[PDB]
Design a protein around this ligand. Structure first.
Ligand code: HEM
Ligand code: HEM
Ligand SMILES: CN(C)CCc1cc(F)c(F)c(CCc2cc(C(F)F)cc(N)n2)c1
Ligand SMILES: CN(C)CCc1cc(F)c(F)c(CCc2cc(C(F)F)cc(N)n2)c1
Ligand SMILES: C[C@H](O)[C@H](O)[C@H]1CNc2nc(N)[nH]c(=O)c2N1
Ligand SMILES: C[C@H](O)[C@H](O)[C@H]1CNc2nc(N)[nH]c(=O)c2N1
Ligand SMILES: [Cl-]
Ligand SMILES: [Cl-]
Ligand SMILES: [Gd]
Ligand SMILES: [Gd]
Ligand SMILES: [Zn+2]
Lengths: 401, 402
């Protein structure tokens, strides 16, 4: 069992949970591939059986009547239909465990509080749209954000897939110009061109909220314009730098991942959007300052009158900290839930300790738990971590085109 | 072959060199252990040696030649006769450079070919060892214009114990367990400090007392040697616009000189081969001064800066850390001691990656050690996927000799 050391304190633990690793990952004794983002018939019963045993142990009901019982109906359901339906409580328990198991999520101290909307009787793109709209309004909650997930019908053979084509529920547009370069978000250029292709009237701005492309099975996608009063956004200002507001920067309140695939007990939900609240460095450091994203770092440094002529003035570092300061200040002033990377990582250290006593370990992806600014200033930096795959899980999935 | 993306540009390469990785690391398809700091007969000596000679003869564009097969047969005959073999001098220079080139956690490897190799394989005693080390320090420091170098002491061999430098670096500050429970000085060096005192060193009581050297000749107890103060170049730390910073009394030393790692060349082992370069400012500014278990100055700096330390969301920690790094850079530049910042360092490592892809079809890199400890995604290496694996020649960790 792997020895895991914390270098700030000197404490040691052993990850015994690592034994249960289902889907083998990308690494071999010959080379480590841990830094790679994407690492390149009736077996349905194996995963269903084990998931059901998970559920009943977690309610202290292993080896007792209702557990014995439930094992048989899944047997008979697959015997008859080739698949099975999840009990409500199980679907809820499975959604929370997928989150709990996500190795790259630093927010997992919250995994126990998740609102699960059952949209398994969904039947059309227009139905999806109102399901998604209930979620958003519920999650957003006038800025007192509440974690939530909506689970659309599980995939079945011979029939089309429910899919959301946008990577998130809120995405800004990305437009090319008379010179190739991009106005707006360069991460969403591809999806912006799909939305225009399917009938959307493109705006002229740098923060145009894209419309949703929702895919009912075996039909094409359909464009859905989001109600603007339902997309809560935060104009960005700085507490002491009065010109920052004039830069016109904005970001949205609800981070809502709408392209990942929920797998519970061998069942696959290709449309299962989940949402929580942002950590400030996601917006301030990655979204606004990545060179391939909004790339605002030099513009803010000019306004701060910084010496951009030498890298050793650390002008980049100074401008980045102030951009994060403005994000936190803005979200707080607008009363929108947000968490800074110091509070977030301290909470994750507490999650690690809980998980050690509860399950004997915790799958964690060091490169993604450590924040993208001030890494060694947070406690997770000095914490050794073990990465592996447990089920149920959120999985990446191909684009439906 | 593993495919490797640069997420900032869209670049894609394939690490074909990883397939030749001989020795194994800690990961499996079950679980990744990349974040662990310490992830760890004549026939097998023969095959390592054979592979190294092949490497050397490739480098001098003489692969397969007369001299190449001569040297292969020579080494096997010497392994048969003596159980070991001896490197020629040029083979030792080439192997020391490759060992730096192959070090996956080193961001300064653009410089790998510019390495001064001192051959001390004739060294006889701890006293001679000390003389060689002082000459190494003098040459590398070079009055603040630092030069990369390595001194190679005699190889491990059966029948005799190893040369060992007990100190983890040639320049270290003492750490004295205090009155209450605190450490005065560098807490990372409590153990080695205690070892020096128990070997007859008279301690000081400052925060920046330079430690003596404990030097081990074969089958000898370690022997204490003091470094002449004028050999150890140091830099008082000041801040360009925070004049109270000078009153903190902080200093750091010019020469980073790792002295406790094992150099492996073609199966041969050099347990004592100290090497030195120059610092990147975040090792001093972020790790050495701001780590909670090191000098831990962050809160004191932020309080002096009049930051609000009662709430995390004011980003006082980030603000104070940026200014500590400014101070380190400004102080080394003022003092005319070589130093590189994490933006320039990570950008020349990107060129290294590119040179290495052309030269060898990839480059072993340990992402979590390459990405700087502050302002990570502001540097280009953050957005570069990397493949970590073990190539030989190599610097390896080894157990402490006590
Ligand atoms: C409640 C507060 C939450 C915070 C502060 C938070 C924060 C983060 C951050 C910073 C990442 C880094 C991934 C990246 O940069 O791409 C991440 C990943 C992830 N989170 Fe959370 N998250 C929260 C809630 C949730 C919820 C409710 C779920 C699911 C029910 C979830 C599931 C995931 C998954 C699957 C990933 C990996 C996705 C990827 O890396 O592409 N998180 N989270
Ligand atoms: C010339 C300037 C150099 C710079 C700027 C530099 C930079 C760095 C940095 C920042 C690290 C990681 C530090 C840490 O442990 O936190 C590192 C590690 C390392 N460097 Fe370099 N280095 C330089 C020269 C050299 C030389 C000359 C050698 C050997 C010939 C070398 C071999 C290594 C090795 C083996 C490691 C890994 C040690 C470990 O595991 O911590 N470096 N370097
Ligand atoms: C890596 N970044 C820079 C690119 C954009 C990006 C790519 C992803 F794959 C991705 F999942 C995300 C959101 C992660 C996330 C998810 C959640 C949850 F509640 F929904 C909350 C939160 N705070 N963050 C963002
Ligand atoms: C948390 N850190 C401090 C770990 C301690 C530590 C362990 C090591 F093995 C190690 F080599 C170092 C220095 C790396 C280094 C080496 C060199 C070279 F010229 F010698 C130059 C440079 N700039 N840096 C530090
Ligand atoms: C636990 C974690 O892997 C450990 O603290 C590592 C992370 N990355 C690092 N990177 C460098 N350059 N030096 C270090 O000491 C570390 N420490
Ligand atoms: C190459 C590297 O692994 C990759 O760019 C990762 C590193 N860690 C990350 N961590 C988060 N949270 N988001 C990211 O996009 C990345 N990028
Ligand atoms: Cl985002
Ligand atoms: Cl150091
Ligand atoms: Gd001005
Ligand atoms: Gd001043
Ligand atoms: Zn790995």
């Amino acid at each position: 069992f792997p020895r895991v050391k914390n270098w700030e304190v000197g404490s040691i633990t052993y990850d015994t949970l690592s034994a249960q690793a289902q889907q083998d990952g990308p690494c071999t004794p010959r080379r480590c591939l841990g830094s790679l983002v994407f690492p390149r018939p009736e077996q349905l019963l194996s995963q269903a059986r084990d998931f059901i045993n998970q559920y009943y142990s977690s309610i202290k009901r292993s080896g007792s009547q209702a557990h014995e019982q439930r094992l048989q109906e899944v047997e008979a359901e697959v015997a008859a239909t080739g698949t099975y339906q999840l009990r409500e409580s199980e679907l809820v328990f499975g959604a929370k465990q997928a989150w709990r198991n996500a190795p790259r999520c630093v927010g997992r101290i919250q995994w126990g509080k998740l609102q699960v909307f059952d949209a398994r009787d969904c039947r059309s793109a227009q139905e999806m749209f109102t399901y998604i709209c209930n979620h958003i309004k519920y999650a957003t909650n006038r800025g007192n954000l509440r974690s939530a997930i909506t689970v659309f019908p599980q995939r079945c053979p011979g029939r089309g897939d429910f899919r959301i084509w946008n990577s998130q529920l809120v995405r800004y547009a990305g437009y090319r110009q008379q010179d190739g370069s991009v106005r707006g978000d360069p991460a969403n250029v591809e999806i912006t061109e799909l939305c225009i292709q399917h009938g959307w009237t493109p705006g002229n701005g740098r923060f145009d909220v894209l419309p949703l492309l929702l895919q009912a099975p075996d039909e094409p996608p359909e464009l859905f314009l989001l109600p603007p009063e339902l997309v809560l956004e935060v104009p960005l200002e700085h507490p002491t730098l009065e010109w920052f507001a004039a830069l016109g920067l904005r970001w949205y309140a609800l981070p809502a991942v709408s392209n990942m695939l929920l797998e519970i007990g061998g069942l696959e939900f290709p449309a299962a959007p989940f949402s929580g609240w942002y950590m400030s460095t996601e917006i301030g450091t990655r979204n606004l300052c990545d060179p391939h994203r909004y790339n605002i770092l030099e513009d803010v440094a000019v306004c701060m009158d910084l010496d951009t002529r030498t890298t050793s003035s650390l002008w980049k570092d100074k401008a980045a900290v102030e951009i994060n300061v403005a994000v936190l200040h803005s979200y707080q002033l607008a009363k929108v839930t947000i968490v800074d990377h110091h509070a977030a990582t301290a909470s994750f250290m507490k999650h690690l300790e809980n998980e050690q006593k509860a399950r004997g370990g915790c799958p964690a992806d060091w490169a993604w738990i450590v924040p993208p600014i001030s890494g060694s200033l947070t406690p997770v930096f000095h914490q050794e971590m073990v990465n592996y795959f447990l089920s149920p899980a959120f999985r990446y999935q191909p684009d439906p085109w």
